[PDB]
Amino acid sequence: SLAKSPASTIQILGAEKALFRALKTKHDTPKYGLLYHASLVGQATGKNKGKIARVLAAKAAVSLRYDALAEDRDDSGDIGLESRAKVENRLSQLEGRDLRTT
Amino acid sequence: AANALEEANSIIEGKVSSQLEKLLEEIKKDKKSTLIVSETKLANAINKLGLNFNVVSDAVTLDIYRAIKEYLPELLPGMSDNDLSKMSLGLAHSIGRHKLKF
Amino acid sequence: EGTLTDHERKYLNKLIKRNSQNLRSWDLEEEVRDELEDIQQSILKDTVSTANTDRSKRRRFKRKQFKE
Amino acid sequence: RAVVLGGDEKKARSFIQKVLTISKAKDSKRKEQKASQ
Amino acid sequence: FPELAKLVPDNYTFAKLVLFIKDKASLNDDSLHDLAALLNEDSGIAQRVIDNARISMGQDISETDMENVCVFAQRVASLADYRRQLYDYLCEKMHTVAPNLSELIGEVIGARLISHAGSLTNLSKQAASTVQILGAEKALFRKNKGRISRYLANKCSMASRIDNYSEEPSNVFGSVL
Amino acid sequence: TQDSNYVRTLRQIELKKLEKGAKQLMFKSSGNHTIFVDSREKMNEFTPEKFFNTTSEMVNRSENRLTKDQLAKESLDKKKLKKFKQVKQHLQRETQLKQVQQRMDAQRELLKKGSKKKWKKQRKR
Amino acid sequence: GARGGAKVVIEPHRHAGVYIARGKEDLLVTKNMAPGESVYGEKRISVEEPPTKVEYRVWNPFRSKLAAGIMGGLDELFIAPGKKVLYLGAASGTSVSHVSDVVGPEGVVYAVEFSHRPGRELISMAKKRPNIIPIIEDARHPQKYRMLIGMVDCVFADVAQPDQARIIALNSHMFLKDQGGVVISIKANCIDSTVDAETVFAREVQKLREERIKPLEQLTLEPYERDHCIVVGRYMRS
RNA sequence: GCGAUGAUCACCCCUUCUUUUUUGAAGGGGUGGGUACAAAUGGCAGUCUGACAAGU
Numbered sequence: 001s002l003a004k005s006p007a008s009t010i011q012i013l014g015a016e017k018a019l020f021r022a023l024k025t026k027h028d029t030p031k032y033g034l035l036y037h038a039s040l041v042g043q044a045t046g047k048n049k050g051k052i053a054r055v056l057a058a059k060a061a062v063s064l065r066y067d068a069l070a071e072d073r074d075d076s077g078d079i080g081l082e083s084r085a086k087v088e089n090r091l092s093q094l095e096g097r098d099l100r101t102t
Numbered sequence: 103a104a105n106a107l108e109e110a111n112s113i114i115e116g117k118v119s120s121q122l123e124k125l126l127e128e129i130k131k132d133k134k135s136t137l138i139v140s141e142t143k144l145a146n147a148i149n150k151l152g153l154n155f156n157v158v159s160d161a162v163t164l165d166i167y168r169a170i171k172e173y174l175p176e177l178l179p180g181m182s183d184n185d186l187s188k189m190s191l192g193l194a195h196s197i198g199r200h201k202l203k204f
Numbered sequence: 205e206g207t208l209t210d211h212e213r214k215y216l217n218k219l220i221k222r223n224s225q226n227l228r229s230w231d232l233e234e235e236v237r238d239e240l241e242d243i244q245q246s247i248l249k250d251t252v253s254t255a256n257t258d259r260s261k262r263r264r265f266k267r268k269q270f271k272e
Numbered sequence: 273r274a275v276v277l278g279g280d281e282k283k284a285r286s287f288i289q290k291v292l293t294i295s296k297a298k299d300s301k302r303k304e305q306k307a308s309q
Numbered sequence: 310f311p312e313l314a315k316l317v318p319d320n321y322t323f324a325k326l327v328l329f330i331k332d333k334a335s336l337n338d339d340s341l342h343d344l345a346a347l348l349n350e351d352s353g354i355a356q357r358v359i360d361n362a363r364i365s366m367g368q369d370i371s372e373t374d375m376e377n378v379c380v381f382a383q384r385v386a387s388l389a390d391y392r393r394q395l396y397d398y399l400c401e402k403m404h405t406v407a408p409n410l411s412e413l414i415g416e417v418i419g420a421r422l423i424s425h426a427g428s429l430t431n432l433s434k435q436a437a438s439t440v441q442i443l444g445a446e447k448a449l450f451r452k453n454k455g456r457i458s459r460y461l462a463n464k465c466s467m468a469s470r471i472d473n474y475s476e477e478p479s480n481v482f483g484s485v486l
Numbered sequence: 487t488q489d490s491n492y493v494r495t496l497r498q499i500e501l502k503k504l505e506k507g508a509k510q511l512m513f514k515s516s517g518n519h520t521i522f523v524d525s526r527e528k529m530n531e532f533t534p535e536k537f538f539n540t541t542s543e544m545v546n547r548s549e550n551r552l553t554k555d556q557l558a559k560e561s562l563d564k565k566k567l568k569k570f571k572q573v574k575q576h577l578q579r580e581t582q583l584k585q586v587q588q589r590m591d592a593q594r595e596l597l598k599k600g601s602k603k604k605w606k607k608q609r610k611r
Numbered sequence: 612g613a614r615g616g617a618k619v620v621i622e623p624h625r626h627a628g629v630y631i632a633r634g635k636e637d638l639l640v641t642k643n644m645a646p647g648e649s650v651y652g653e654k655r656i657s658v659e660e661p662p663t664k665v666e667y668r669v670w671n672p673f674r675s676k677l678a679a680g681i682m683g684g685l686d687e688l689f690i691a692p693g694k695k696v697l698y699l700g701a702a703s704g705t706s707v708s709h710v711s712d713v714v715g716p717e718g719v720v721y722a723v724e725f726s727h728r729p730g731r732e733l734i735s736m737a738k739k740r741p742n743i744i745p746i747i748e749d750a751r752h753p754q755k756y757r758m759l760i761g762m763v764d765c766v767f768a769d770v771a772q773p774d775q776a777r778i779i780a781l782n783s784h785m786f787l788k789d790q791g792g793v794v795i796s797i798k799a800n801c802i803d804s805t806v807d808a809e810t811v812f813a814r815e816v817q818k819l820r821e822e823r824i825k826p827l828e829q830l831t832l833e834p835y836e837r838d839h840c841i842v843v844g845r846y847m848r849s
Numbered sequence: 850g851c852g853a854u855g856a857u858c859a860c861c862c863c864u865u866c867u868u869u870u871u872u873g874a875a876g877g878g879g880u881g882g883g884u885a886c887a888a889a890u891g892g893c894a895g896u897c898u899g900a901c902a903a904g905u
Contacts, residue, residue, distance in 0.1 A: 008896085008898075009897085013896080016896065019895095023491050023494075023896095024495060024895090029898090031897085093903085103365075104334065114756075140757060141757070168785070187719060190760075190761075192366050194745060195368070195734065195745070196366075197746075198730070198734050198746070201747045201748070202731055202734070204731075220558055223552075223557040224544070224557055227552070228543070230633050233563070236567060239567060241514070243571065247508065247513075250577065257837065257838075261807075276579075280893095366738060437855080460855095463854085467854065486854095494895090495895055495896095496895080498895045498896085503894095506612075509654075510612035510638075513835075515672075515679070515834070516833050518830070519828070519829070519831075521686075522816075522826045522829070537686070548682070549631075549637070550624060550625065550631055551625055552625055566636070569635055569636065599901090611900095611901085648888095649889090652891095
């Protein structure tokens with residue numbers, strides 16, 4: 001049931017009370033949900049937390065769908081590891097960006 | 103049940119199990135006896151064993167197997183119909199788990 | 205054993221009338237069915253849809269036929 | 273802004289307007305008498 | 310092995326037998342006697358569990374899972390033992406603290422009456438009418454039925470005073486009361 | 487006065503509410519029924535009463551044709567018309583919300599950054 | 612509509628093991644073998660009988676083709692309490708569970724299904740129903756699961772395959788009783804989509820006759836389904 | 850052989866015949882409510898957007 005969900009839902013999976021309140025009242029919607037307590041999100045700072053949640057949720061669906069729907073999956077997590085590296089690279093270049101002009 | 107599943111899988115695959123080897127070898131004393139087998143694959147497998155049995159698997163035999171399966175509980179003293187059904191239920195789940203690669 | 209005398213085959217016929225009479229109350233009057241059925245087709249046609257499958261059936265029939 | 277509301281929320285919204293008109297009527301009547309005196 | 314849960318409805322007995330029958334595959338005649346010793350064979354569950362275990366639709370779970378079923382069952386088993394110990398402690402403590410009240414109605418019922426009041430001091434201060442409605446929500450004291458409940462409430466009010474305002478209360482007055 | 491997110495949520499409520507309401511309803515069968523008979527003389531003597539073993543009134547009722555051997559409210563039905571109409575009213579609301587959302591979708595599409603000759607054929611980098 | 616707090620009156624159908632809930636709305640209904648839970652989210656109706664609570668489950672004709680058969684006025688349904696049934700094409704417990712309700716504790720249902728993903732769902736439902744015997748195997752080879760199935764009273768098939776009449780014949784010859792039931796759900800498109808549905812149904816009837824199955828009646832499943840019909844026949848070995 | 854150490858104080862399941870005659874004869878259960886615990890794949894209840902961003 002989690003594998004059949006788009007990465008957008010996985011991003012805001014645990015914030016339904018805030019989500020539907022915001023949708024019905026013309027207000028900004030949550031951007032972390034239950035993934036807020038993931039280690040990679042904590043490593044991010046400022047608005048980068050919202051961006052990493054979008055990236056990490058997208059990679060979570062890729063790794064999760066492989067876990068659920070793979071017939072001959074190896075119990076190694078190799079798809080998860082390579083997905084993690086992509087997010088770490090995305091965090092590094094996203095963090096290295098400096099908003100203040102030098 | 104573990105033995106039953108192994109015996110069940112051999113029947114499905116058309117292979118002769120060791121339990122069936124011993125049972126046939128007991129009757130081997132009877133020279134030139136015809137063996138009626140429900141499935142042709144099992145009939146061919148029994149033939150290769152070199153047992154002195156003329157193995158037959160014909161559409162006409164399906165009537166014999168059909169009558170026996172109707173009156174199987176009465177044919178086998180000591181086992182009631184409920185027991186056979188409840189044995190079938192347990193074995194079925196064990197096979198289904200193996201087929202589904204549980 | 206089919207030993208019904210005249211009296212049993214009349215008491216039963218009343219029971220048929222009695223039970224059949226009662227079910228009519230559940231079955232309801234004809235007048236509301238006229239409006240109810242009209243609503244049903246409206247609620248059906250959209251939900252089932254299947255306007256398209258009528259078209260696809262006609263298309264598949266048309267394509268195969270030799271054209272001259 | 274236009275909105276779509278459930279039955280219970282309509283009843284809640286209907287009730288509060290009824291109260292507010294009664295309060296406005298009771299307050300104005302209270303004002304008029306004290307103005308007269 | 311879903312079948313066992315139906316066989317032994319008594320949950321405490323169910324846990325103990327689960328500790329013995331960790332794996333339904335293991336079925337020996339000596340083991341049958343050992344589980345036959347568990348509770349009694351009058352219900353016949355000793356023969357049923359062997360018959361059901363040989364043939365059932367239960368799916369075998371991992372060794373780590375089985376480790377938690379037993380370990381979690383040990384936690385349940387210990388709590389039952391401690392609950393019995395704490396119950397016996399309650400009865401002994403009720404006698405020394407409130408011998409008159411415990412004798413009149415009982416240790417458990419009297420202790421609940423004390424808790425609803427908030428303390429034994431509170432209970433002794435209340436009037437008889439308030440004491441009756443203090444236990445009118447769990448039916449502690451329960452037209453002729455109402456008369457006894459009111460009558461017992463008045464005596465319970467008196468017994469609580471002898472307990473509260475005596476340095477070393479006796480049970481002599483609770484007995485006659 | 488409303489945004490796209492608000493209208494989308496309302497329609498999604500109605501769609502699920504419509505699905506539940508429809509499942510609650512019953513719809514009378516309109517399928518064709520044919521009986522296979524062995525011989526022409528059996529075909530001619532066939533009548534619905536004998537084949538089904540019925541009275542006439544049960545023959546008309548396909549949904550609960552009780553056998554004869556087995557046989558041996560205006561306010562209430564106004565609620566029925568109310569029930570079927572509510573499911574119809576959820577339908578009318580759902581399509582009315584669909585029309586609004588499409589217009590909001592079109593406006594946002596027109597605001598999108600594109601060639602917009604009608605869209606010219608241009609791959610987006 | 613027929614909301615949670617709504618009250619209904621339960622009365623019996625012609626078919627044994629099938630019931631209707633009166634009220635405003637008439638709902639096709641079966642008793643729950645495993646009360647307190649729904650297998651696919653269907654509504655349940657509660658009645659207090661001396662007091663023990665017997666539960667009911669709603670049978671949705673739009674989700675089950677057999678239910679659409681009952682709505683259409685099916686004359687004879689061999690599926691009845693205390694009978695063995697072989698359910699071919701048992702994708703999941705959506706309709707088998709309702710069949711399991713009709714047969715009751717005494718009867719059994721042999722649910723045959725091939726694809727693995729719906730198969731695991733079927734096993735999860737079978738655990739709640741002791742009278743369902745699931746078989747994860749291809750119906751094209753009844754010899755494979757011959758051991759698990761005894762002689763059955765009726766054979767119901769929902770397999771949407773072009774060669775379903777062959778599958779029905781092999782299973783019926785090996786497992787169906789003489790004078791037993793055969794109920795076939797036929798989808799015109801799977802067999803032959805270019806021709807009209809009426810022609811397809813006539814062809815399937817001819818095939819069953821060749822396989823010694825006497826057709827008794829036929830019924831289209833409109834409005835619950837399109838280009839579908841249910842054929843009920845009796846198996847004449849003689 | 851009493852009592853201030855306390856008496857007393859929701860709903861439903863005339864007719865016929867006759868007369869020594871002003872005379873005689875016959876016709877416990879179900880609802881509802883209150884308190885505490887447990888379960889529901891029962892309800893509210895509907896799962897955000899969608900192609901650019903960053904540097905020279």
